[PDB]
Every structure is written in C-alpha cells, then in structure tokens.
C-alpha cells in the first residue's frame, strides 16, 4: 500500500535543502524563528552592513523563505510561514539529542 | 521590542545545521524517508518500492545509519529499519507542507 514520493516531488524538496544549507542564511533565520525584525536590527544583532542584510534578505524573499509587512515607518521581516520555524527547531534538536 | 536580547546561533552551530541540510538535499535520501516515514521497513520492502536491488538499497540504508537518520532493530529472522526520532518526522512533513503552500 506504501509508495515512496514522486520523483519530481523528491527533487522539489532536495533543492529545498540545499538552499537552506548556508551559515550565513540560517543564523538570519535563527534570529527571524524568535521575532519579526528590521533590516537594521539583523545587521546589528549579524555585525555587517544594513546593505549586506538588504541583499541576503533578497534572496531569502525569492525563495519563500521570508516575508515582510510594513507598520508605519518601518519594513519587518519574519520567516514565511510556521512549518519554517518547525522544521527550523526540529532539526536543531535533533541535532543536539545526537 | 526584544530585538536587544537576541543573539544569532554560534557560527559553530550554523555550520553544523548547514552539513545536516546538505545530507538531506539528496532525492533517493527523500524517497526513502518518505516510505519510513509511514513505516518501519525490511530492506526487501524498501527495494520493491523503489523498484531497484536490495543491495543498493542497503548501501543507501548505511549511509543513513551513519549519519544518524535511520536506525533498525531485529525481531527475529528479519531487521526492520526505521527514523531515528520524531524530529526527523516532523521536519520532513514540515518542509513538505511548506512546499505546497
């Protein structure tokens, strides 16, 4: 009765993984999975330049990774939806309970 | 408001996180946890359904074993393999649901 995922839906999911295997991508979203945040507050909390948080965070929007609202003078940024923030956590406990 | 108190994971830990990612970022690796994910399977099991040998079918499985992703246990005259915990259950079904909205 069991049938593994389609192939095409196994290469989806792969290059998923592969875009979040980046340091520098998962220490933005290590601050994103605990509070929406500005551009200048990730740049301070990363230590380098509001125009290089600009940038990544770029990427990060294309790939549906993050999202933004605005809230009068200022652009937040959060993590996309909740399954981010869950596979975020799970991964870090299992990485830590082995 | 609490933007103060937070401080970004150590680089130590990124990097960590960011070779676990790299593991999974393998189609057979995902076709093959989408079946434990559902049960706990013989090596005979896993090879009907991804129609290859059961000789690279457990190649595969050593892999995994080593990088702490599936275990196994025998009950008599056959070894059953299974995930190694529930979190790599759920940031699977996490990264899927994900996927399609």
């Given at each position: 009765?069991?049938?593994a995922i389609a192939p095409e839906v196994a290469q989806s999911l792969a290059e998923f993984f592969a875009v979040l295997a980046d340091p520098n991508r998962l220490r933005l979203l290590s601050l994103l999975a605990r509070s929406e945040l500005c551009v200048g507050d990730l740049a301070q909390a990363i230590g380098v330049s509001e125009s290089a948080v600009?940038?990544?965070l770029r990427?990060?929007?294309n790939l549906r990774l993050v999202s933004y609202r605005k809230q009068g003078r200022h652009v937040y940024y959060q993590l996309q939806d909740h399954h981010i923030v869950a596979?975020?956590?799970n991964a870090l406990?299992?990485?830590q309970e082995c």
């Open positions: 009765e069991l049938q600009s940038h990544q990427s990060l929007r596979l975020y956590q406990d299992h990485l």
